Amino acid sequence: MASATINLSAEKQVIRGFGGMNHPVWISDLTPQQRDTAFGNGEGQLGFTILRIHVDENRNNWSKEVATARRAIELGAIVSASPWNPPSNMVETFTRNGVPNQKRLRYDKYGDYVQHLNDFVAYMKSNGVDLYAISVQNEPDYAHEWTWWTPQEMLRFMRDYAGQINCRVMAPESFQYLKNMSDPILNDPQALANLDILGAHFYGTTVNNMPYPLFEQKGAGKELWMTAVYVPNSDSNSADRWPEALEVAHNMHNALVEGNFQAYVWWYIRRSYGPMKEDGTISKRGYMMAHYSKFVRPGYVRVDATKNPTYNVYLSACKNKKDNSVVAVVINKSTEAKTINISVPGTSIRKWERYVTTGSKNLRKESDINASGTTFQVTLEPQSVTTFV
Numbered sequence: 077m078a079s080a081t082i083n084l085s086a087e088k089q090v091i092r093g094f095g096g097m098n099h100p101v102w103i104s105d106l107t108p109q110q111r112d113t114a115f116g117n118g119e120g121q122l123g124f125t126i127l128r129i130h131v132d133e134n135r136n137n138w139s140k141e142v143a144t145a146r147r148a149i150e151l152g153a154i155v156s157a158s159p160w161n162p163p164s165n166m167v168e169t170f171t172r173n174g175v176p177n178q179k180r181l182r183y184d185k186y187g188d189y190v191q192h193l194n195d196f197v198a199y200m201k202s203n204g205v206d207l208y209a210i211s212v213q214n215e216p217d218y219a220h221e222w223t224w225w226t227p228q229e230m231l232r233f234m235r236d237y238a239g240q241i242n243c244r245v246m247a248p249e250s251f252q253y254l255k256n257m258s259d260p261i262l263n264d265p266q267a268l269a270n271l272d273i274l275g276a277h278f279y280g281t282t283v284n285n286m287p288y289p290l291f292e293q294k295g296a297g298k299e300l301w302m303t304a305v306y307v308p309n310s311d312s313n314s315a316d317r318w319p320e321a322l323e324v325a326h327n328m329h330n331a332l333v334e335g336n337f338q339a340y341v342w343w344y345i346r347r348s349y350g351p352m353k354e355d356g357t358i359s360k361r362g363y364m365m366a367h368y369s370k371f372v373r374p375g376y377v378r379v380d381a382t383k384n385p386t387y388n389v390y391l392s393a394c395k396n397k398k399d400n401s402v403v404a405v406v407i408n409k410s411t412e413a414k415t416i417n418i419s420v421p422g423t424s425i426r427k428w429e430r431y432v433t434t435g436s437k438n439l440r441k442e443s444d445i446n447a448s449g450t451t452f453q454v455t456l457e458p459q460s461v462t463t464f465v
């Protein structure tokens with residue numbers, strides 16, 4: 077009989093949401109039906125609340141983003157946009173660690189690059205897409221195939237130019253949440269003032285690298301978003317592999333509880349290793365996401381809770397401040413069942429519904445949990461995720 081405690085009085089980060097990437101230039105756009113599967117929150121829908129899109133370097137491509145972005149917004153999502161390269165007339169080449177022909181933004185074009193970003197913001201606004209945020213650069217520190225920014229180039233842009241962007245500014249979107257890319261911004265008062273959202277990717281980011289003390293120190297009034305990952309691999313036709321898919325839930329748990337992230341955004345929504353399969357159905361990896369996205373809605377607040385109450389069991393909890401209700405997401409990676417007494421002191425809640433995913437069922441509604449006082453005794457099937465609501 078393991079125990080856990082959920083402390084509804086110890087509020088952590090406010091949840092902004094969950095979602096993934098659309099890229100209708102590199103791959104096919106989501107279809108009408110796939111837009112609904114991704115951003116609706118009905119039966120057989122993922123309940124995503126964040127769409128990420130790219131800012132094409134060629135403005136003649138911008139129209140390709142509109143249908144999916146508009147539909148996501150109609151269904152209640154917010155949209156964030158990231159550039160990979162500036163327009164070619166703003167780029168120059170340089171040699172980086174002996175590798176020639178690498179791209180950077182010309183320093184003398186920083187003002188023009190702001191205008192490019194602002195033009196994108198205005199174009200999208202004119203088409204019913206009020207962007208929540210725009211990034212300086214996708215993966216400035218992993219730009220073999222796009223545009224590099226050193227930590228200092230990123231800093232100088234954030235300090236000197238980002239205040240001119242007509243949107244919330246996201247930076248720096250390091251590929252692995254490398255703190256050398258973001259520390260300069262947090263330490264410079266002008267750059268920090270111009271920041272709105274600290275964005276990070278999770279490729280190869282270990283749990284020990286998910287906390288960020290400097291952001292805890294300096295980041296008041298800034299959001300913290302995990303804007304791209306796939307886990308645990310991008311193997312072809314892997315999205316239903318079990319128990320590998322449990323790594324998706326675990327990574328989300330870790331982002332939330334170890335990283336204090338307010339948003340978790342996958343790479344391509346529709347892909348053979350993604351949350352939606354090429355046939356338009358939800359994969360096992362997608363149901364992992366859905367355990368969070370369908371239930372932990374924007375504006376819920378994470379609360380302190382025993383994160384790992386017994387070996388191979390992981391727990392997160394979020395509160396709806398409208399009525400102090402609780403959503404708990406509990407991962408059991410063990411090959412045996414686990415029984416846990418979850419204490420929720422001070423709650424007036426006395427019953428939880430539960431939905432369970434395993435290798436053989438998806439979001440199956442199982443028997444209700446009736447509390448004895450403020451303690452909810454739950455039994456977790458082997459190799460499962462359960463959301464309690």
Ligand SMILES: O[C@@H]1[C@@H](O)[C@H](O[C@@H]2CO[C@@H](O[C@@H]3CO[C@H](O)[C@H](O)[C@H]3O)[C@H](O)[C@H]2O)OC[C@H]1O
Pocket residue numbers: 102214215221304305343
């Ligand atoms: O020239 C273009 C290529 O650059 C492009 O290759 C893609 C580059 O992006 C990789 O996706 C990355 C996945 O990991 C993180 O989320 C990255 O930031 C993404 O950019 C893709 O796997 C490549 O296919 O292909 C299109 C071509 O026009």
Ligand SMILES: O[C@@H]1[C@@H](O)[C@H](O[C@@H]2CO[C@@H](O)[C@H](O)[C@H]2O)OC[C@H]1O
Pocket residue numbers: 215218251279280
């Ligand atoms: O798609 C790209 C990934 O392939 C890349 O993967 C990471 C590279 O660094 C390693 O230390 C990590 O283990 C690995 O996941 O991340 C960047 C992304 O653009």
